[PDB]
């Protein structure tokens, strides 16, 4: 992987949560998501891909992954998804924009999906 | 996993994807993803994540995944996360958000995201 | 504007909602809003705009607009974009995606935006 | 409107775009756009709606608008809705999302719809 190791560590985003990844050569994403807000206690597990033969031309790394909101202390019946790109350099950043979507009942799946934005940084 | 079974197997979006998953007891999906569009071709990776005890209540199962576009064919510089909701029965459905990021310059971050919407099916 | 005559009107969504159009040669949009669903009662004022020249190669015509949930009934705190494209015809659709932005502290607007899709024709 | 004054005015978002707005006292916002990004050069007709009675307990303000990206210069045939909540005080903001759309053929509808967030300020 091109930045393999840019992305492995701990991150943290704008809210205080902190992201453990690491980075495979084959693409994959794998580690821990604590989120400092909304219904979640401790660590779950997350998952997701990245690209690992990025572009050379000064563009980011593109790259998503998923945690389902279920652990052993909770269950908040949902899932977030970030899509987003890595950045490289003195000042890393990986810029992504999320969705949350809850378990409802048909009548109120039209309400079921947040949507927003976190930066992750590798201070804070 | 109370749907791992309802999850499991072949899908299809309105696009004519193919969406190949594994949902596994602990909350795991695994397996590849097709797109009828784009710059796709052939199978890609896919990794992502389901509530594996959902709510009884009548409500839907969240879950969520990421494809990154690079396999052995191609490599658009991008990922595309899926985020919704399983919905079981005779009509199984899983009713999705996506956001779609491309690795861009920072001067071109603020068009790097698509989003739409994908209705898989066990049909078509 | 070459849909003018074609995106006046009333419209219907998925969920029975009412939208009532005015398009005006000056790229205008002009109505009210009536929805199903959430905390809402009666019309609603909107507004927006469309593109009143739009390309002739059989490529919908982009549009927008606004409802903010307050009127003599009810406030919601809240507003609501839809933004998409026109596509003409015998079967006319309304093709959108929204975002509801709820007013929120500071604490909770990591959660204030719910996303979504409606398309709405001119029967139902 | 409560917040009639504050939200009148120029505003300027982290890309460098000018937000030229007046806040009616029924709920109206008027005015024009200019990107400093895309396919756009000078100013844009906007119109949307705010919340003229917002909740007293330190909430946010919400309102949308939207620009059709034609004017007498240019048409790049597509609309901005921009959805959020305006937040009072000595550091005025208004912290949005958007959404992009686009008129595009049936087959590459798919990929009409760019999203992302600016965040507005009374400096820069
Ligand atoms: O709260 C969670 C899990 C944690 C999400 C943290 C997010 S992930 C994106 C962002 N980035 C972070 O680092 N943290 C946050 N899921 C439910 C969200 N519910 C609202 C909500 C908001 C605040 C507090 C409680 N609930 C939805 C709901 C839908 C139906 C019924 C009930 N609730
Ligand atoms: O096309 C892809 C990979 C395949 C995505 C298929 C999507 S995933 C959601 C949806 N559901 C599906 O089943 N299929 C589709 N990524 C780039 C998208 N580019 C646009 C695009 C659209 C159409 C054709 C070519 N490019 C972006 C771009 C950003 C910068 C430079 C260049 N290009
Ligand atoms: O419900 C509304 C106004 C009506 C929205 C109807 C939407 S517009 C897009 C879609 N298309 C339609 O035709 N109808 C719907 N706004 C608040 C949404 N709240 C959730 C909600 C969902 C269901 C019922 C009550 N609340 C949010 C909230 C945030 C903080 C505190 C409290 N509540
Ligand atoms: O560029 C525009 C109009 C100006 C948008 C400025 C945005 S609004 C949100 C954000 N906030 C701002 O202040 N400025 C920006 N619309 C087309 C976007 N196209 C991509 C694009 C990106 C960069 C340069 C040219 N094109 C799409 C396209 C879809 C099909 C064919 C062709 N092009
Ligand atoms: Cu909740
Ligand atoms: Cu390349
Ligand atoms: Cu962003
Ligand atoms: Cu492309
Ligand atoms: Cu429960
Ligand atoms: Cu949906
Ligand atoms: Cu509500
Ligand atoms: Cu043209
Ligand atoms: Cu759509
Ligand atoms: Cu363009
Ligand atoms: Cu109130
Ligand atoms: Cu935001």
Same mark, same amino acid.
């Given at each position: 992987?091109? #930045? $393999? ?5 701990? *991150? @943290? ?10 980075? =495979?050569? #084959? ?5 821990? %998501? $604590?989120?400092?807000? =909304? +219904?979640?206690?401790?660590? %779950?597990?997350?998952? =997701?891909? @990245? #690209?690992?033969?990025?572009?050379? #031309? ?11 909101? /279920?652990?052993? %202390?909770? +269950? ?5 998804? *970030?899509?987003?790109? %890595?950045? =490289? ?5 990986? +810029? ?9 009942? $048909?009548? +109120?799946? *039209? ?10 940084? /590798?201070?804070?």
């Amino acid at each position: 992987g091109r #930045d $393999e190791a840019g992305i492995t560590g701990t *991150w @943290y985003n704008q809210l205080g949560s902190t992201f453990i990844v690491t980075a =495979g050569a #084959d693409g994959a994403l794998t580690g821990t %998501y $604590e989120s400092a807000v =909304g +219904n979640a206690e401790s660590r %779950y597990v997350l998952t =997701g891909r @990245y #690209d690992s033969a990025p572009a050379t #031309d000064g563009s980011g790394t593109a790259l998503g992954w998923t945690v389902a909101w /279920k652990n052993n %202390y909770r +269950n908040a019946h949902s899932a977030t998804t *970030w899509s987003g790109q %890595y950045v =490289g350099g003195a000042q890393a950043r990986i +810029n992504t924009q999320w969705l949350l979507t809850s378990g409802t009942t $048909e009548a +109120n799946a *039209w309400a079921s999906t947040l949507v927003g934005h976190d930066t992750f940084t /590798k201070v804070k």
